[PDB]
Nucleic acid binder design. Structure first.
Length: 50
DNA sequence: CTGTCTCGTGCCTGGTGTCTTGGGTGTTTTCCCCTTGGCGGGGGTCTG
């Protein structure tokens, strides 16, 4: 995935395990100065979180 | 009939709130430094 696809990332430690979340851009989540970045096909499936 | 104000969504975007960073400024924290901690023979002098 290109770094542009990723919207942000977060990391958490739970003593026994560590969780790393990665959020991409998608319709509805393109908040802020990225609104003008209209996706080429907003009707497709967007992977929003991993 | 009738249409203008209102409730109730979608949509989105722009405006709210706050991490993050830098500077000013007082305060502890170590190290360094200064002050401190047996025997005898004489002599003379004073009191009675």
């Amino acid at each position: 995935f290109h770094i542009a696809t990723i919207k942000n990332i977060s990391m958490s430690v739970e003593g026994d395990y560590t969780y790393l979340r990665i959020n991409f851009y998608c319709p509805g989540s393109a908040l802020g100065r990225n609104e003008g970045n209209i996706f080429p096909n907003p009707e497709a499936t967007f992977v929003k979180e991993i």
